[PDB]
Amino acid sequence: KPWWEDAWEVPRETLKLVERLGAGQAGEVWMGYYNGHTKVAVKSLKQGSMSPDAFLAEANLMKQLQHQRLVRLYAVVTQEPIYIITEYMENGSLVDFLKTPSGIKLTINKLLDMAAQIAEGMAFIEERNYIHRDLRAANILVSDTLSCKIADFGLARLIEDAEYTAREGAKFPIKWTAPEAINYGTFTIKSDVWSFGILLTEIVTHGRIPYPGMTNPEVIQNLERGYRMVRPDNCPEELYQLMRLCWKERPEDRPTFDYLRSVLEDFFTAT
């Protein structure tokens, strides 16, 4: 729908940017207010860094994925400078939140609860035939009530058949990416499953880098031998075994997100 009929377009006058939340080569993210009273996050495009069409594509996809466990699209301003306005998550990225005084104090029970919330959002993404491709603790946002939501849908894609193939020179974070994706550029919801297992290690170590003390080549070498990440310190064996399921060799042997959600809720409502 053209902007003049688009229920999501808002005049830029409705927004007041107050504090920078994040910055990058492609733009910034600011906390601001919509119509004076409503707190929101505003993602601005750094003019020239990337195509505006590319930037806006993420908003168009978010329109198709509305769910409580996914950061919600609020509005867009499609005239330059362009903005994607979204739901504000007070405690920022989970990977950062877990290192704060509040985060450090969380019990394993609350961490299990948070993992279950994340699996619940991915189960929605899964059932709608989408994939995220950048599932890591940096991309999980935390609300003021310590509820988690999936964010950053830049790489997210609608899966027509069963797989999306990235193009030749596409590069991805080796430590979080599934081997078939590193090797063949092939992504499916099972690749996200692999990433979730890695994400679980980030939750339990309060934000530590996965595969401690290893470089990317060492990670690849170890994986190809049949090894997986060494048990993190103070990681409940039940959770470690759930991670191992996420890291099954064959994509088809990895569980669904709805299965992971169900198990993590049992773990939580046990601890």
Domain containing 16 — which CATH number?
3.30.200.20
> What are the φ and ψ backbone dihedral angles of 28, each rounded to 5 degrees?
-135, 170
Are 220 and 175 a contacting pair, CB within 8 Å?
no
Are 133 and 157 a contacting pair, CB within 8 Å?
yes
d(CA 119, CA 155): 18
Are 92 and 141 a contacting pair, CB within 8 Å?
yes
143 and 249 in a common domain: yes
Q: Which residues pair with residue 93 across a beta bridge?
A: 141
222 and 155 in a common domain: yes
Looking at 88, 104, 136, which one is the last position of a domain? 88
114 and 83 in a common domain: no
Q: For residue 163, which of 195, 130, 134 has the smallest C-alpha distance?
A: 130
250 and 154 in a common domain: yes
Catalytic residue numbers read: 134
Instruction: Tell me if residue 15 falls in helix, strand or coil.
Output: strand
Q: For residue 255, which of 271, 239, 244 has the smallest C-alpha distance?
A: 244
Q: For residue 257, which of 136, 94, 115, 160 has the smallest C-alpha distance?
A: 115
The count of domains in the chain is: 2
Please give the single-letter amino acid code of residue 183.
N
Structural tokens at position 51 = 């195509």
Query: Any residues with CB less than 8 A from the CB of 208 and at least 6 apart, and which?
Result: 201, 202, 232
The domain in which residue 247 lies consists of 89-270
Instruction: Sort 25 into a burial class: Cβ within 10 Å, 0-12 / 13-18 / 19+.
Output: exposed
* Count helices and strands in the chain by DSSP H and E runs: 9, 11
149 and 36 in a common domain: no
